[PDB]
Amino acid sequence: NDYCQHFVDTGHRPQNFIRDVELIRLKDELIAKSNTPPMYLQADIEAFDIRELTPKFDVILLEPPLEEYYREKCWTWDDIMKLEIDEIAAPRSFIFLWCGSGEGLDLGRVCLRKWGYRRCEDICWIKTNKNNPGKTKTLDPKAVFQRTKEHCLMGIKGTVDIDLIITEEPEIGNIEKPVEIFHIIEHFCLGRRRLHLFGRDSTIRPGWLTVGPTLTNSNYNAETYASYFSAPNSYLTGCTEEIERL
């Protein structure tokens, strides 16, 4: 009955017991047909001037490498808050910020507001430990509870899915977030200009521009990129038919 008690008794997290961890496919197909070719750029985001990334984005996914992701160089909230995200967001646009499980849940909201967004969803990545019951970690010293989830805050500026992702906890030092976040974002049909900051070779994806320090290669060209969104395709949502040409 009481899965909290059960966790205390056995080390199996309550979420281990959630079961089941249309033409939603037709729509996945339209996303795939709409998607720009994958574009990517190796850039030191601290040293690099963000305004070089054009045009202005419909969606920004921001995944700064927090020290908390590495238990057994990282960005602090000081560093993140000083990013010039409002300089590259479209007047109507969305952001998804991975905030971790600690002070990020507060500081990430200050960030969103600083950049001109309002927080409109809180997506939790709940991590199961089905293959590794018990086997716990050193609490951040302010922690009261074992932290078994991560939050991705969604923000909107200007004017299908559930807010949970459940997967098994990744092996130690594996920093990746669930690819399901992309499925959630793309299903909102928000526009085709999609930026992933602090992406990696492993996250590069059709329909996205990926920018990050560890990229081994680049293909980014601002003019070529801008040409994917020129008329008559300026206002596509990314969930509708390509416009016929000759």
């Binding site: 899965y3 017991f17 009261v144």
Partner: protein, 211 residues
């Protein structure tokens, strides 16, 4: 200790909570002003800010349920009242077969699978059992608008035998070691002698009026 259930039927805006003493844990489930017409009475942002939460504890923990824009307002209140937020519990709402209950609300982008409870700390809490529980609750949606009973067990393992206070609690919430406040409770049931004395002298005619 295991002090039996106590409660006070009141308007929480008007009760002088200084008569209750100090608690290791405060929990609140406020009827936040979620900018919307609702069938129940809400508290304005100002009334929430003005609640005299700071008198209820010197050292300990606050559990504050939040939803919608109260995710932000609740953080403001928490800070305003002298707490730092150090954890966030989510309750994943299921049915009797452990399937997520998924409700959608207009003006929202996503279906919601969970409720959030902020955890704040004030002062120098000592002798708490940190890290026994984890920060996800998976439990059955019973009555509409109720919280899961699991939270009480988590709090008791965290802080066994200490005095606790719940604000905006329902009758089914009353419990040993807790004093429960809310306006749907049935009169007043107080057993702690210290509280009984202070209440008699503050409220000799038993009446808890707009001050």
């Amino acid at each position: 200790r295991l002090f039996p259930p106590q409660w006070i039927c009141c308007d929480i805006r008007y009760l002088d909570v200084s008569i209750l003493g100090k608690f290791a844990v405060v929990m609140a489930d406020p009827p936040w002003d979620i900018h919307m017409e609702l069938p129940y009475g809400t508290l304005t942002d100002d009334e929430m800010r003005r609640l005299n939460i700071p008198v209820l504890q010197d050292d300990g923990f606050l559990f504050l349920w939040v939803t919608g824009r109260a995710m932000e307002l609740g953080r403001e209140c928490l800070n305003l009242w002298g707490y730092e937020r150090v954890d966030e519990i989510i309750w994943v709402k299921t049915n009797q077969l452990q399937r997520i209950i998924r409700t959608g609300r207009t003006g929202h982008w996503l279906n919601h699978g969970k409720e959030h409870c902020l955890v704040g700390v004030k002062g120098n809490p000592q002798g708490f059992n940190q890290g026994l529980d984890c920060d996800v609750i998976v439990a059955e949606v019973r009555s509409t608008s109720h919280k899961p009973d699991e939270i009480y067990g988590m709090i008791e393992r965290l802080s066994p035998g200490t005095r606790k206070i719940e604000l905006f609690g329902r009758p089914h919430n009353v419990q040993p070691n807790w004093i429960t406040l809310g306006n749907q409770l049935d009169g007043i049931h107080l057993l702690d002698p210290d509280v009984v004395a202070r209440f008699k002298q503050r409220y000799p005619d038993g009446i808890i009026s707009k001050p």
